[PDB]
Amino acid sequence: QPLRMRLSELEQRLNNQQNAERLLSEFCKRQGRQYQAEDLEALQNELEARQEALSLSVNEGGERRMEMRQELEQLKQK
Amino acid sequence: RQGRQYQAEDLEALQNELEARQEALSLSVNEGGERRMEMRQELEQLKQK
Amino acid sequence: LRQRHTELEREVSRFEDQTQQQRQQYAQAKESLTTLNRLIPQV
Amino acid sequence: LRQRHTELEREVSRFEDQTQQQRQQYAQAKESLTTLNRLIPQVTLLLDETLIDRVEEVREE
């Protein structure tokens, strides 16, 4: 009887392992083709850094482009 | 921390709600910042005038 | 133009306030999402 | 001043191209990041590449 409960629990563990493997493969195929599935936390950190880069780039581009557009307005009045 | 029991038994659905909030976060903050920045430059123009 | 400065400063204040409150509440929600999918991602 | 307008138009084009490209690229990066932190946020460590293969033994027992 102990082995019966062990069997059920282990079957659920196999289920979760296949879930993880399938999801890993599908992502690693969607972005990349085989993308360090063994330890992928570092890529999450770098992608967060690239989101910070997103904020920086978008703000800088917007403010600079619109400021030089205002310079264009000054030139137009001139 | 958020809610009091708020269907913790299977809380998957809440994550989607928070995802909508997360996208709206980027939209709202980007637009607001851009507006205030536009009027910062307009303020500089008025100062220079 | 000084009157324009005054109204512009009011508007700048409104946007700064709105963004501050908005980002605070939305950031709290985002942090809740991260805690959910870090501590209990269908764990 | 018309020379200035010409060069400024070129620079406006460059700014617009750069902002568009960067926002698209980092947006796709954001989508991939969210898929990772949704589906496998350290779930790989729960998996740990164990390859238990013991259900057969439990069935024999």
Closest among C11, D61, D9, B26 to A68, alpha carbons compared: D9
What value does the CA radius of gyration of chain C take, rounded to a whole number of Å? 18
DSSP D49: T
Closest among C10, C25, D18, C7 to B29, alpha carbons compared: C25
Q: CA–CA separation, D11 vs D37, rounded Å?
A: 38
Size of chain C, expressed as the number of residues it contains: 43
Residues B36 and A63: beta-carbon distance below 8 Å: no
From which experimental method does this structure derive?
A: cryo-EM
CB atoms within 10 A of CB D33: 20
Which of C8, C11, C30 minimises the CB distance to B25? C30
Size of chain A, expressed as the number of residues it contains: 78
Provide the residue type at C31 as one letter. Answer: E
Q: CA–CA separation, B22 vs B18, rounded Å?
A: 6
- Residues on chain D touching C38 (C-beta within 8 angstroms): 37, 41-42
Which of D19, D40, D55 minimises the CB distance to A10? D55
CB atoms within 10 A of CB A20: 20
Tokens found for residue A65: 């482009």
Which residues lie closer than 8 Å to B37 by C-beta, 6 or more apart? Answer: A59, A62, A63, A66
Closest among A25, C37, A51, A48 to D41, alpha carbons compared: C37
- Residues on chain A touching D12 (C-beta within 8 angstroms): 65, 68-69, 72
Closest among B11, B27, A25 to D27, alpha carbons compared: B27
CA torsion angle for D15, D17, D23, D25 (degrees, to 10)?
A: -140
Provide the residue type at C39 as one letter. Answer: L
Which of B37, B42, B45 minimises the CB distance to A63? B37
Q: CA–CA separation, C29 vs C22, rounded Å?
A: 11
Distances (CA, A) of B48 to B7, B25, C5, C11, C13: 58, 34, 12, 19, 21
Angle C32-C18-B33 from CA coordinates, rounded to 5°: 95
Neighbours of D, requiring at least 3 CB pairs below 8 Å, are A, C
Residues B24 and C26: beta-carbon distance below 8 Å: yes
Tokens found for residue B9: 């038994």
The resolution, in Å, is 3.7
Cα distance from A67 to chain B (closest Cα, Å)? 7
Q: For chain B, say whether C20 makes contact (Cβ under 8 Å).
A: no
Residues B35 and C25: beta-carbon distance below 8 Å: no
Closest among B15, A45, A52 to C40, alpha carbons compared: B15
CB atoms within 10 A of CB B4: 6
- Find residues 45-74 of chain A whose CB sits inside 8 Å of chain B: 58-59, 62-63, 66-67, 70
* Residue environment code for B22-39, b if the CB has 16+ CB neighbours within 10 A, otherwise e: beebbebbbebbebbbbb
Q: CA–CA separation, B49 vs C14, rounded Å?
A: 24
Q: CA–CA separation, B17 vs A33, rounded Å?
A: 31
Instruction: Indicate the SS3 state at residue D41.
Output: coil
Residues D12 and A68: beta-carbon distance below 8 Å: yes
